[PDB]
Design a protein around this nucleic acid. Structure first.
Ligand SMILES: [Zn+2]
Ligand SMILES: [Zn+2]
Length: 50
RNA sequence: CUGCCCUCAUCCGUCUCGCUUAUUCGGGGAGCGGACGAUGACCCUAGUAGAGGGGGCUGCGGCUUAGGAGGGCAG
């Protein structure tokens, strides 16, 4: 499926999911952190203590 | 304008800090705004402009870019 050029995340041409301006929520989120680029926890639970 | 970091994460501790609130108002109680701190990670390379590697996300096609808003610093 050569859909290159048409975004599927939002549905707007010119860019793709990788460059989707709506890239934030409503996706999947396995166990990564899109706030500190962390690998394991979630952004919603991303924070520091000591 | 771009990079990084922090805050909204119904987060925490600190702050002679600011605001609001209590039968629409003050150095206390609480919530929020600002600073500090979970790239677990950045470093290196050759022909140092810039470019690439794992690496950013992806419908794998890729491009190598940018990603909601406010503050600090750098050019
Ligand atoms: Zn899009
Ligand atoms: Zn995180």
């Amino acid at each position: 499926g050569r859909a290159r050029g048409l975004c599927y995340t939002c549905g707007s041409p010119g860019h793709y999911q990788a460059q989707c301006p709506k890239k934030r929520k409503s996706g999947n989120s396995r166990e990564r952190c899109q706030l500190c680029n962390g690998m394991g926890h979630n952004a919603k639970q991303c924070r520091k203590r000591d």
